Ligand binder design. Structure first.
Ligand code: CLA
Ligand code: CLA
Ligand code: CLA
Ligand code: CLA
Ligand code: CLA
Ligand code: CLA
Ligand code: CLA
Ligand code: LMG
Ligand code: BCR
Ligand code: BCR
Ligand code: PQN
Ligand code: SF4
Ligand code: SF4
Lengths: 93, 144, 80, 100, 73, 37, 159
């Protein structure tokens, strides 16, 4: 029917799905637009990650212009990997 | 017609696996097992949900309660015109036959049946519940 | 187990048997009516008391009754 | 045979055809280093029965609650001999008629 | 609730609950001794009436004592 | 000649609020589930 | 297209469970095999003390942080720990009476493992085994809550 036993490999690990995921999304994620004044969406909150890593135990402020960077960065990072994994065209496309 | 036994090596219809199958009424008390012989492959409906494909030839299923076997029996009988038979199986290797248990399904009258639970009076010829009072237990007057 | 009783006003029209979803009713030979049949309830341990037999009976006040009684694991219809 | 080409319901092999499997139950020994068997089975020897620990919880429950009554005076917020240190609503009773 | 919503709905709900507790790992080690079923048709009427009467009485007693003793008391 | 002591609510209240319900419910629960031989 | 992940349990589409990467994924399966409630080869007393040690130590916390004695310093820990020990006591009582009600009659018939072989029945599921498990739970839980107090009093940057 569907199957008779659960296959113990279901995520077929193709090793260059993740490296192309974040490597092929972050090398164009740090270009530099007019929009930020010459900064990236990977270096402008590198400043932030290190910045509130300085004063360590203080959890950063709940309105601090970098939660936006965290959320909008992962909103694309996860998407590019989840569309990379459907780059298993081994039998479909 | 004698009382037939089943042959437990018949294949089963193709089905994906529902939630609604056998729970532990089967492990301790009983579960029911149905059998029929098909003529051509066809899609029918399980009385739990989903659709299954019956095989060309003998088939075999298993169910929890009896109304499921009767539902599948009515559906296989009035829609596809087949002859199913379902058994009762106890969880130690005991097999009881039922439906028809007379050869003929119980609408066409088969000579050689003994009528039980069969009062022989008009419905309004029952005694009052004051005259059956103070017996071993609760009694309806039409139970005497 | 419940109590299912067939009375003599039965005309033997087989409606109760086709309405029973549990196969506790069957038609036996009889010599009291035109159809020469009469219903009977040989297996009231499988009855759950749904009362479709009462709904299917044509003759007024019915020729079949289902008296409710002590429930069991089969008369409750429990599948688990 | 049960585990075959869709041949289910093996009559003599009931513990497969029924749905009685141990899903996650392994069984092997030596989960623990050995002498905790000693230190804990020689420790739970007293209360290892139905009446024993059931008596123990009675003994401890009584000896905790009854002493909570008269040595749970660690302020209990209000009641226990900390009391109303102001004459709270003695004469304040009614709104139109005072009534004490 | 016991008045408006009659039984069988709860029977089906309780049955899915039975499935959930039966197939949950690490909590399929504790079973019922007597199978859980929904309240019967006659009983739920009595229970609903009990709640109706008790709530009715407590509400009116509270209002009566509080109002009369708040003004004159 | 009869007077209960000053510490009497402190002891008798949680007794009848927590202990007697506990013994009652445990005993009754063992009684309910007993199998007849 | 000739690829499927979700399967019925051990073939057999007519048992009401179906296998998913939630239930039958390998790392999840080995994880829940290694928990103390599924080991079957150890004596139930020892499982009792392991489970009790875990649950008491976790149960102590919320009474400490959120109990009615949480702002008064240096005694907020005492009342919490004591209340948690009380809860563990009541859990032990519940285990005892469950043993008195559940295993009071005959056991079941048969058991096999998933990759079929006839494994024997777990000795936790008899009256003696369950009572021993309850005693182990009491010991472990009280030891755990006492350790929670101990751990509060000597710990580098507890707050
Ligand atoms: C290394 C892990 C770690 C540790 C030890 C702490 C420890 C602490 N965090 Mg923190 N935190 C962490 C990761 C961590 N956090 C992460 C990943 C985030 C999301 C980016 C936060 C967001 C966060 C906030 C928003 C706050 C804390 C706060 C706190 C303190 C309570 C405590 C010192 C609180 C605090 O004291 O900050 C003022 C607080 O308000 N944390
Ligand atoms: C990362 C990553 C990787 C490794 C691939 C890889 C692949 N994609 Mg793909 N894709 C990605 C991201 C990625 N894509 C994203 C973010 C989008 C949007 C697409 C949209 C896309 C389309 C529309 C198609 C592919 C196709 C393909 C395959 C050719 C190949 C395996 C093509 C294919 O399989 O043929 C195809 O039709 N992808
Ligand atoms: C959210 C809406 C809501 C709802 C559903 C209720 C529900 C209830 N409130 Mg209530 N309450 C609410 C908001 C609400 N309250 C709010 C916001 C207030 C303001 C603080 C109150 C103030 C309040 C008071 C002061 C009382 C209730 C009472 C009641 C109960 C009446 C039940 C009953 O059988 O009445 C049956 C209703 C009647 C028998 C008649 C109601 C009064 C009518 C209008 C006049 C009396 C009849 C008249 C003398 C003779 C004419 C009869 C003729 C037409 C045939 C019930 C539990 C009453 C109670 O306890 O019930 C006894 C009560 O005393 N509540
Ligand atoms: C039956 C009437 C009755 C009622 C309703 C109450 C009600 C109350 N009494 Mg009480 N009391 C009564 C008679 C009653 N008393 C009598 C006759 C005596 C003299 C022995 C006392 C002596 C007494 C003391 C010394 C104290 C109370 C206290 C209390 C209060 C806390 C509850 C408690 O711990 O009670 C405990 C009550 C008793 C130990 C006496 C009960 C003795 C009889 C034999 C038990 C009756 C069994 C009952 C009918 C069965 C119901 C249970 C069943 C459903 C399973 C509560 C207001 C406490 C209080 O004042 O706190 C402010 C308290 O410290 N009572
Ligand atoms: C949501 C309620 C709650 C609260 C208020 C606390 C509160 C606390 N926990 Mg705790 N804990 C909880 C739930 C909670 N826990 C849960 C659900 C778990 C998972 C089982 C844990 C697991 C846990 C561990 C493992 C430890 C704490 C510790 C602590 C204390 C250090 C802070 C603090 C009293 C630490 C502690 O005891 O330090 C003294 C500690 O070691 N907790
Ligand atoms: C259901 C909602 C709710 C919630 C959240 C609370 C919460 C609280 N009440 Mg409360 N209360 C409620 C309803 C609620 N109340 C109701 C309806 C009443 C009236 C009957 C009261 C009456 C009441 C009183 C009279 C008092 C409280 C008090 C308290 C506080 C301490 C309670 C305590 O010690 O907890 C004990 C803690 C636990 C039982 C923790 C268990 C929860 C664990 C952490 C869940 C963890 C799940 C985890 C995620 C699972 C992960 C599994 C994974 C590891 C595999 C706490 C803030 C007390 C107080 O002083 O408040 C400040 C107090 O005196 N309450
Ligand atoms: C008449 C019945 C009754 C009585 C007498 C009490 C009494 C109490 N309740 Mg309570 N409660 C009741 C019914 C009752 N409840 C009901 C019906 C509910 C549900 C609606 C609740 C829900 C409730 C909540 C949610 C909370 C209470 C709490 C409390 C305590 C508040 C006292 C205080 O300020 O904290 C001081 C508390 C202490 C000093 C801790 C004492 C702990 C116990 C009594 C001692 C145990 C001794 C030890 C474990 C024995 C050792 C055993 C050995 C094997 C090691 C007090 C013991 C609070 C509480 O205790 O939780 C923290 C609380 O948060 N109650
Ligand atoms: C807060 C926590 C409160 C805890 C309160 C204690 C709870 C005790 C639980 C007992 C319930 C089980 C009932 C039972 O069947 O008996 C359980 C055992 C008897 O054991 C029984 O034996 C039977 C065969 O004869 C069967 O095997 C039963 O299954 C078995 O339970 O009795 C006890 O253990 C009772 C011990 C405790 C007695 C408490 C007396 C209370 C004192 C009054 C207060 C004085 C205040 C001053
Ligand atoms: C935000 C931002 C930005 C950006 C954006 C973007 C950039 C977007 C895009 C995105 C994208 C655009 C994505 C995607 C990617 C993809 C890729 C990169 C792919 C690749 C593929 C491949 C590599 C393949 C390969 C293969 C294989 C695997 C096998 C063999 C064959 C083939 C070829 C198929 C900007 C700049 C404005 C600025 C900053 C900020
Ligand atoms: C894995 C996992 C998880 C979880 C975890 C957890 C939940 C943990 C917990 C844990 C815990 C919760 C623990 C506890 C512990 C405890 C302990 C460890 C204790 C100890 C104690 C002791 C040891 C004591 C002793 C003693 C004393 C002192 C007293 C008495 C006597 C004696 C000697 C006994 C996570 C989520 C992350 C992820 C997923 C999975
Ligand atoms: C909720 C609900 C249920 C479900 C109710 C259930 C499953 C029982 C819920 C009761 C729980 C289990 C305990 C309730 C707690 C009480 C304090 C118990 C009191 C017991 C006395 C002996 C004191 C029905 O079966 C039902 C049937 C017909 C009409 C309406 C309804 C209905 O509304
Ligand atoms: S009540 Fe239902 S099951 Fe019983 S005899 Fe009538 S129709 Fe059949
Ligand atoms: S339906 Fe009524 S009349 Fe008809 S056969 Fe049945 S009992 Fe007799």
């Amino acid at each position: 029917a569907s199957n008779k036993s659960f296959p113990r490999d279901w995520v077929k690990t193709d090793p260059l799905v993740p490296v192309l995921g974040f490597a092929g999304w972050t090398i164009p994620a740090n270009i530099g637009v007019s929009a930020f004044g010459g900064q990236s969406l990977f270096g402008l909150f590198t400043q932030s990650i290190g910045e509130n890593l300085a004063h360590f135990p203080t959890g950063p402020a709940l309105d601090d212009k970098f939660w936006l960077y965290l959320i909008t960065y992962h909103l694309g990072l996860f998407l590019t990997i989840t569309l990379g994994q459907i780059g298993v065209q081994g039998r479909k496309q | 017609w004698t009382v037939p036994t089943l042959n437990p090596d018949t294949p089963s219809p193709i089905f994906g696996g529902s939630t609604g199958g056998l729970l532990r009424k089967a492990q301790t008390e009983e579960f029911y097992v149905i059998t029929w012989e098909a003529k051509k492959e066809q899609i029918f409906e399980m009385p739990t949900g989903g659709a299954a494909i019956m095989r060309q030839g003998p088939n075999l299923l298993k169910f929890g309660k009896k109304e499921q076997c009767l539902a599948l029996t009515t559906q296989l009988r009035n829609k596809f015109k087949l002859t199913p038979c379902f058994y009762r199986v106890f969880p130690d290797g005991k097999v009881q036959y039922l439906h028809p248990a007379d050869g003929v399904y119980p609408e066409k009258v088969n000579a050689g049946r003994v009528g039980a639970n069969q009062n022989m009076r008009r419905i309004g010829q029952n005694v009052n519940p004051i005259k059956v009072k103070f017996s071993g237990r609760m009694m309806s007057p039409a139970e005497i | 187990a419940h109590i299912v009783k067939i009375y003599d006003t039965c005309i033997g029209c087989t409606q109760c048997v086709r309405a029973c979803p549990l196969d506790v009713l069957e038609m036996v030979p009889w010599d009291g009516c035109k159809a020469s049949q009469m219903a009977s309830a040989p297996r009231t341990e499988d009855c759950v008391g749904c009362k479709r037999c009462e709904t299917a009976c044509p003759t007024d006040f019915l020729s079949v009754r289902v008296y409710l009684g002590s429930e069991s694991t089969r008369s409750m219809g429990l599948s688990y | 045979k049960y585990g075959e080409n869709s041949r289910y319901f093996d009559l003599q092999d009931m513990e497969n055809t029924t749905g009685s499997w141990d899903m996650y139950g392994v069984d092997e020994k030596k989960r623990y280093p050995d002498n905790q068997a000693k230190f804990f089975t020689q420790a739970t020897d007293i209360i290892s029965r139905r009446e024993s620990l059931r008596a123990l919880v009675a003994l401890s429950g009584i000896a905790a609650i009854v002493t909570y009554g008269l040595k749970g005076a660690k302020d209990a917020d209000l009641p226990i001999t900390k009391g109303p240190q102001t004459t709270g609503e003695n004469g304040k009773g009614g709104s139109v008629r005072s009534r004490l | 609730m016991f008045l408006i919503s009659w039984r069988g709905y709860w029977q089906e709900l309780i049955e899915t609950l039975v499935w959930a507790h039966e197939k949950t790992p690490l909590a399929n080690l504790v079973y019922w001794k007597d199978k859980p079923v929904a309240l019967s048709i006659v009983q739920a009427r009595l229970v609903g009436l009990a709640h109706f009467s008790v709530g009715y009485i407590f509400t009116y007693a509270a209002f009566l004592i509080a109002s009369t003793s708040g003004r004159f008391g | 000649p009869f007077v209960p002591p000053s510490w009497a609510p402190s002891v008798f209240v949680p007794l009848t609020g927590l202990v007697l319900p506990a013994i009652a419910m445990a005993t009754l629960f063992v009684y309910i589930e007993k199998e007849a031989p | 297209k000739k690829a499927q992940v979700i399967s019925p349990v051990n073939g057999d589409p007519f048992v009401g469970m179906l296998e998913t990467p939630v239930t039958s994924a390998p790392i999840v399966a080995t994880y829940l095999s290694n928990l103390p409630a599924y080991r079957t080869g150890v004596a139930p007393v020892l499982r009792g003390v392991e489970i009790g040690l875990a649950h008491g130590f976790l149960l102590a916390g919320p009474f400490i942080k959120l109990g009615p004695l949480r702002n008064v310093p240096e005694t907020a820990e005492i009342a919490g720990s004591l209340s948690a020990a009380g809860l563990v006591l009541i859990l032990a009582l519940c285990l005892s009476i469950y043993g008195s009600a559940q295993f009071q009659s005959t056991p079941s018939i048969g058991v096999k493992t998933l990759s079929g072989r006839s494994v024997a029945r777990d000795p936790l599921f008899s009256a003696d085994g369950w009572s021993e498990f309850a005693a182990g739970f009491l010991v472990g839980g009280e030891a755990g809550v006492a350790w929670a107090y101990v751990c509060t009093q000597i710990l580098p940057y507890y707050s």
